[PDB]
Copies of this chain bind each other. A is one copy, B any other.
Amino acid sequence: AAVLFVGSAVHGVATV
Seen from chain A, the residues whose Cβ lies within 8 Å of a Cβ on chain B are 1-16
Contacts and interface: CB of A to CB of B under 8 A. Distances in A.
B3 A10 contact: no
Copies of this protein chain in the complex = 18
Contacts of A2: 1-5, 12-16
Contacts of A16: 1-2, 4, 6, 10, 16
B3 A5 contact: yes
A5 B13 CA distance: 9
A10 B2 CA distance: 10
B14 A12 contact: yes
A13 B13 CA distance: 6
A15 B13 CA distance: 9
